[PDB]
Design a protein around this ligand. Structure first.
Ligand code: FAD
Ligand code: FAD
Lengths: 481, 472
């Protein structure tokens, strides 16, 4: 009953039918059921959890965590602490095994949650075949009809192809292939210095690869990142041995007879042609919304120029009982963003108000040092004509950072001059990912820099750097710098 | 020859050195007196800093020497400890941070006087240096920040040789074969875990029935203890120590008994760590002559502006009432001097977090279940295990849980308790929430980054508020 796979083709009735089981979809489904809706979730893949769990957040963070420790052991760090070891060697198969084990546990967990919450799991490819009907096509060619009051589209995203370069997940890989390489490549080129590219590039660099990232734009870290932070982040990555060719376009790539790959590059403006060679080519220039064979055209739901499904503030499409959330709509393509849209969408179905402020959605980069931010950047505030003041504190002056001998980076706070209201928080260094959530909480209340400065932060913690940066923004000076 | 000052601070610990810096920033002509060779007080020289350094290093030693690194494909033939080098890393951090305080004094034009300060007048402090020389400071206000010392155990003499305090324990020259810890408070658990990791056979003896000191939630404490025992950390709770004898062969015989009575036995060790507590330090400060009396526990009584009975003489930090913690002393120092300048003075000890930097970490802020029951407060509970958290699972580090206590009428968060990875950093999000008077629903609806440990804090709140979490 709760699983409808091949062979199960009796028509189903539902209040809410969710197409896709990624962060957006599976949370939306669970919450809908918790709200009392008779809920169905359709997923075409063999496991639940979507991009994030299966080929995304989870496997990438696993390799980042493991490769960092490998670097700590293989390099100078452990030695400096009195931990002496004759021969540190990499066992990639074992490392990959740890990653796969985490993915499997968490995928299995979602299935248990569906079952615990009485969510009907339909395994097949969903297509909307009426304003109140979805048809699922299963692996054996069977079909199953779901008559449903509301439809929630959460069909997610796919890798953006590069014209003339064919991804084969052999020597020319996407992020998916890069997460499962069978050996450390001697030399790797990364097309795209966004978050995904920097993370995967750093991983293989740690494990011994000679890595170069090529980026068309003039900075690293994707859209919205504060420029000062991005520049400082880059300089740090470069000192680690991570090379960058910014303001550069790739004109093509050729797989040679000897197995290597020749990448042809040029200045983005034009000029200065040259070729660079590698063993593995990682193509990650972006991701785009996925809606293939969903039945949108027949319904008359037109996509925007970038392939997104247009929705209103209640996440309704142009057909009022059909909704869309997550990577398939506008906004930051992030897991927690998809999740929050899913929750409030179904809360709206149940009659509640629906509001989300994308300015309060944090971004994190899980390199070492980490990068994290929430709210506005300096570029944004200038663009919007907002008058602000700046507070900074370096981690070199933080007691927990100094003690751990892990002291790259800084916290930067942006406050409004008139009211001292916190407008943006930008963290480069250890613990950025956890710390930005303290800032997100502050933004929710419209807290001041003084507010945070006067909160008793535990000593010694990395969070004290956040306290001190706010104090500097508010009072003009910190205590410890 | 005498110095004139607006504010004279006696002691350079977290309370004193921050108070001095701030006073100078506020425009007060400021002097700080320190009797020790370096600045930074207990926390920097023999406290927080050296202890966290050894906790960090011994944790990584355990990861390399044990199973963890192997499971992640990080293979190592023979991992060995170089204790002299590990101690060196510790000392290097202490030295860098003590020096940093000296630079901060200079940067903010704080005058540093080296000697033993004694109050010699309502408006005068005299510092006597080691060679007997004196430096007199005539001053408008006096800020007492003289901190704390170790509480001795009666009948047992500490010599920092085989019977050590926390100071001696932080600098042992070799891993003791067998070590006994008197006191299972925070300091005792932290130092014991360090040496257990480095190869010592460690047993902690505690008179009370739980570990982690006062104020810790009982459920949390019991779960913390069980995890520590599986690591190999042994405990004798509800046990009293009756004495210890320094033997001829250099070893130590500790006599113990059931706390209620009726189970005498003796156990032997190579090193005995005595950490049953700390107490306020005010020795030879000139208080008696002034008529400033101490309370029964040795603290200086102060009012809401931290004034003693003599209104221009103040006291903050470990020498007064409240939690004996570094960040507490720091905040008291700041608001004390803000008050001198005429401003408001506020600290809420219910919003002061506590952290234990073992692995797993422990952290809490606000009220425990035992406190809420004592006070007759009706509350609801929300829990979320790190086993169901995505970042914890991805890192393969899944011990423990977050527990949120909320009041039923208003959904106000009353207490947060964290056992597991990242607890120390995470409690600061919780401190902000309590200071703002957050509801459990508030936190549940804040967008936390995925995947992060903080999501367990979000989910625990959702459970307290809505009754159910999403991922558990
Ligand atoms: C390497 C990589 C690392 C990343 N790291 C992070 C990170 O650290 N933090 C973060 O926030 N984000 C991260 N992301 C982004 C995150 O994965 C996405 O934002 C998120 O997965 C989008 O959630 P979703 O529910 O909208 O879509 P998806 O996760 O893409 O899920 C869509 C689901 O719908 C299925 N589906 C599609 N169409 C149909 C159909 N017609 N019928 C049935 N099923 C269908 C798909 O099979 C898929 O499972 C990362 C992404 C990548 C590639
Ligand atoms: C092993 C250990 C670990 C700890 N870990 C932590 C932790 O992780 N987090 C936390 O918050 N707290 C921790 N603490 C507690 C912390 O050290 C204290 O709460 C804090 O140091 C108190 O600050 P203070 O300014 O009030 O006093 P103190 O730090 O004790 O400084 C007092 C200063 O005054 C000097 N002095 C005293 N009398 C005079 C005099 N008459 N004239 C001149 N100078 C004088 C003293 O030499 C000293 O330097 C730990 C303590 C110990 C022992």
């Amino acid at each position: 009953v709760l699983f409808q796979g091949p062979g199960a083709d009796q028509p189903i009735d539902a209040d809410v039918t969710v197409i896709g089981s990624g962060p957006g979809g599976y949370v939306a489904a669970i919450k809908a059921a918790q709200l009392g809706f008779k809920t169905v979730c359709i997923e075409k893949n063999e496991t639940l959890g979507g991009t994030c769990l299966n080929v995304g957040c989870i496997p990438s963070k696993a390799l980042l965590n493991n490769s960092h420790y490998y670097h700590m052991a293989h390099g100078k760090d452990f030695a400096s602490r009195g931990i002496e070891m004759s021969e540190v060697r990499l066992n990639l198969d074992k490392m990959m095994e740890q990653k796969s084990t985490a993915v499997k546990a968490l995928t299995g967990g979602i299935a248990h949650l569906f079952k615990q919450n009485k969510v009907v799991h339909v395994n097949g490819y969903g297509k909307i075949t009426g304003k109140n009907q979805v048809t699922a096509t299963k692996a054996d060619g069977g079909t199953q009809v779901i008559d449903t009051k509301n439809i929630l589209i959460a069909t997610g995203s796919e890798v953006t192809p590069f014209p003339g370069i064919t991804i084969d997940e052999d020597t020319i890989v996407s992020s998916t292939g890069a997460l499962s390489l069978k050996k450390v490549p001697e030399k790797m080129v990364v097309i795209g210095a966004g978050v995904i590219g920097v993370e995967l590039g750093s991983v293989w660099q740690r494990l011994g690869a000679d890595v170069t990232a090529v980026e068309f734009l003039g900075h690293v870290g994707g859209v919205g990142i504060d420029m000062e932070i991005s520049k400082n982040f880059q300089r740090i990555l470069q000192k680690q041995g991570f090379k960058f060719k910014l303001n550069t376009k790739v004109t093509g790539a050729t797989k040679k007879s000897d197995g290597k790959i020749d990448v042809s590059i040029e200045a983005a403006s034009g000029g200065k042609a040259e070729v660079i060679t590698c063993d593995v080519l990682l193509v990650c220039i972006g991701r785009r919304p996925f809606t293939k064979n969903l039945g949108l055209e027949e319904l008359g739901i037109e996509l925007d120029p970038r392939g997104r499904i247009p929705v209103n503030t209640r996440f309704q499409t142009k057909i009022p009982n059909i909704y869309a959330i997550g990577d398939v709509v506008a906004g930051p393509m992030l897991a927690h963003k998809a999740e929050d849209e899913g929750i409030i969408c179904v809360e709206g179905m149940a009659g509640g108000a629906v509001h989300i402020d994308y300015n309060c959605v944090p971004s994190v980069i899980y390199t070492h040092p980490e990068v994290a931010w929430v709210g506005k950047s300096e570029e944004q505030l200038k663009e919007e004509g907002i008058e602000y003041k700046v507070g900074k504190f370096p981690f070199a002056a933080n007691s927990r950072a100094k003690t751990n001998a892990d002291t790259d980076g800084m916290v930067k706070i942006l406050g409004q001059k008139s009211t001292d209201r916190v407008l943006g928080a930008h963290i480069l260094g250890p613990g950025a990912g956890e710390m930005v959530n303290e800032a997100a909480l502050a933004l929710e209340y419209g807290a001041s820099c003084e507010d945070i400065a006067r909160v008793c932060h535990a000593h010694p913690t990395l969070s004290e750097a956040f306290r001190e940066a706010n104090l500097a923004a508010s009072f003009g000076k910190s205590i410890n710098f």
